[PDB]
Symmetry: C3
Subunit: 379 residues, 3 copies
């Protein structure tokens, strides 16, 4: 039973794939935590003027921009090129988008996606693949379908290299030399998924098909929950970003001040993949037997699964502990066990007293000694 | 293949957990019938002035009140305490509800639930847990997350949710002394107190002598039935057409009562597994699978459960003044196909199609359709 | 891992069951391709004046009429007989429909279905069963629940639904004599009469010279196509945008016809598995997986099936005057991604993104985009 987990560990990637233009790191999808969550996690690093070459995946994805700035393009079936430049055209393509640190990008199942770092700073993008989504009609192995290149799977060759050249020549009405490049015959195998682009790239961009697929949930955004002496929380859901209703995925960004806490809580209807972005915090996770299945530090760059209904609480050990939690539900609901208007505060006082064998005045203290809802300032 | 079932048996609970204030009985969730259905079944008995302590579950539930009366509270995230009494307050909590015999209660996934017996009569509550629901993102092992106490799981085949946290954390978060936190964690309790506890003086809560949406509906004898024949019996189903919460749970329930020697025509559920739990009396049931084989022919008596898999045909004859049952179904809009009777599936075929299919005379096909005028319930003789 | 397929094969039925009035052929549902797709496929042939006897299935189906004409009836629960004939009636039943070559018929889960060949030509019907549909709450073994006959399941890996019930029960419920119940149960019937039976005198049913919602649509040559090039071919898909019942089944179908030496560009299904069934002629198909490996390169000829897994790329070239096919898809709204062609996924990328990705000259990227002006179908040479 994949989720009878008695002990959890802060996880690092167990595989690194270097390409000429960057790095892709994958967490082992067969690790017990990721099989319980039913997802896969990867982290891509794009050096300046490097291009993540186009690929599509047989499952929905959420991509969080941990660092950097650049451009991405999602290329949809049944959509015309709405970006046009004269001279029959000098250039033509579907809408492209800027991304920045703190953006969540929703990639629907099967949609082609590419990404370009146009700046001097490396882009770091953490992507969550929901391999157990009911939109994945294959199997639980994460797959990438690359339209270009000649490299292996992240967890080889591109989609065109399996077709006959004479077929592609007739269908495209192009000579053999173009089809050989299309198929990536002459490509060094080490060029990889992220490639260098010497001169940089000129695309059409200013100094339904066009629906919004990204939203910033980082520090620059307006938070859902904020206490200037404890921290902040901001979730992107299908109430903010309608595409997520199709992906059945959401994400929560949070930042916790040193020695600040958020109360014990659990996700009613989702597994969470907690990925630390900055600093460290001591996390405590409790299962149905009331046993600690994790008590320890989660530090920047590592992932930790919080199974559905498992209770969790945290205390920051840094100036700012901040994280992104990917959740397997477009409308993940949080149940707070303690605090103002918490699940305990919603019970009649004499129900609390009898349940815990407490004095009436002790039940009231349990409810009302701390006035805070979710974030608790230090001490 | 979990549902290639050749033989079914009337099932009783195989485990009993006695607690201070009552009893909890569980059916084996690994039994072939319950794995085919993809559910778990339990029965809780609350003595007078006893409290089922708050817990949440990682799957949707339906609770049928077989017997008794009392109060229940569901505690939702993101909802304020709408019950308020002065003296900041003397008491404050979310809406509480009275329950009575015949009530179905819908408990959404992950929602905290507690129950209190307010009367001199024991409450008996039968709860169905849909462990194979898509809302259960864990596994098929039914789990209870208890907010209080220091006891084992109902389905261990322990401690409360707070006992896994460090005390210094809870003290800081709550701003309370160590003695309150030790009680919170259930340090003050023998493992035998259990899930249902006594409350000596009774209980005083705020109650008259979206967050507040209705989550229960009575489908018992006191309610108005959907189908009724005064010489055969009655049926009343609660669906998402009656109780919109059930649209989220993907669960429904059917209550039925059958007069002595009255029958149900053979019928099947198009789109659901049924967990048949007898409430009163007994009946002879016949269930047949796709091979045309009888996979069950025998008595179902009060207190026992029987799974009717999707599309399996079933028929019944009451052997008591009143045979009554509740059928939990794994679909908020479970549809029944009647194989025989007025406007049944056979009556919906052209007569000459019926004749050719069964190699019957024209007049024999008409008798098959129209000798009995009743739809679903058939009076004796 | 069910879909880690290193080679695909054009598949033929591996079992045939002859009956009095026709033939039923089944593809092995345990073949690795069908396990990856999560479906079962069968082909039924009805001789003139033959009747496919009523049955219901625990999963949604799409039926394509490869050949012939006749009548079908779907018999729904909770629906009255809207066809009536006087003289207290001479005949009465639920709505019946004519079907013809090119029709897709949607049979919802659990609904009774029968079919009758009314003509001098054999009817050939290819039916797809989505056993991995979440509406199938049993297991992935395809099941038929037959209301008549005394034969075995078509998928042997018997008796009708009434033969599992006790005779005395059916007599009481129906108020009919013992002779009629024995016919109902098929005790007298030879086991080889089977699922499709002859009807000697032909058949008279009520038909002209919600319950009545539309459940079939013609997607064949006689219909108006979605995509058409008079020197390449045509495509016509039925989705829930055309036939709302498919919204419930989560199934769709694509009909296509490809002229000799014409091609359709490499493409993939974003959100569905496809069961490609050739109807006429031959074509050379290429299917490549995520490693860029050819998992199929060969001919698909009329009468055979080929699974195209979700996201696997596929391309085709016709070797006949007309290659035509029907592709069943496990999504009511299957979306196609065209990798090459006008407004294809490559044409939707900036030219310098194409150039850098494939290390092409700027002018080579433009040729990749714009040398061929066609979207999906490519004429010869």
């Amino acid at each position: 039973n994949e989720c009878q987990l008695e002990h959890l560990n802060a996880l690092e990637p167990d595989n690194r794939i270097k390409s000429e233009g960057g790095l892709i790191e994958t967490w082992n999808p067969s690790n017990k935590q990721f099989r319980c969550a039913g997802v896969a996690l990867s982290r891509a690093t794009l050096q300046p003027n490097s291009l993540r070459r186009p690929f599509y995946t047989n499952a929905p994805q959420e991509i969080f921009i941990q660092q950097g700035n650049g451009y991405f393009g999602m290329v949809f079936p049944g959509c015309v090129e709405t970006f046009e430049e004269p001279r029959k055209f000098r250039d033509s393509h579907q809408k492209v988008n800027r991304f920045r640190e703190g953006d969540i990008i929703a990639v629907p199942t099967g949609v082609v996606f590419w990404m370009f770092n146009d700046q001097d700073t490396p882009v770091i993008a953490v992507s969550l693949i929901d391999t157990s989504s009911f939109q994945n009609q294959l199997d639980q192995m994460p797959r990438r379908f690359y339209l270009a290149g000649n490299h292996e799977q992240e967890f080889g060759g591109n989609i065109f290299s399996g077709f006959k050249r004479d077929f592609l020549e007739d269908a495209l009405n192009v000579n053999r030399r173009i089809v050989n490049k299309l198929q990536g015959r002459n490509e060094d195998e080490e060029k990889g998924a992220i490639v260098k682009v010497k001169g940089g790239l000129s695309i059409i961009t200013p100094p339904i098909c066009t629906a919004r697929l990204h939203q910033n949930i980082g520090s620059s955004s307006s938070p859902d929950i904020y206490n200037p002496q404890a921290g902040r929380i901001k979730t992107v859901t299908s109430f903010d970003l309608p595409a997520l209703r199709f992906l059945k995925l959401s994400a929560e960004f949070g930042s916790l001040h040193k020695n600040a806490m958020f109360v014990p809580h659990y996700n009613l209807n989702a597994n969470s993949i907690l990925y630390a972005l900055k600093g460290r915090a001591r996390l405590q996770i409790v299962n149905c037997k009331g046993n600690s299945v994790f008590d320890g530090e989660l530090e920047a760059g590592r992932a930790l699964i919080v199974p559905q209904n498992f209770a969790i609480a945290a205390k920051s050990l840094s100036d700012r502990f901040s994280y992104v939690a990917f959740k397997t539900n477009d409308r993940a609901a949080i149940g707070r066990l303690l605090g103002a208007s918490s699940l305990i505060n919603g019970m009649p006082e004499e129900v609390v007293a009898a349940a815990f064998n407490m004095e009436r005045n002790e039940a009231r203290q349990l409810k009302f000694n701390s006035p805070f809802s979710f974030l608790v300032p230090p001490r």
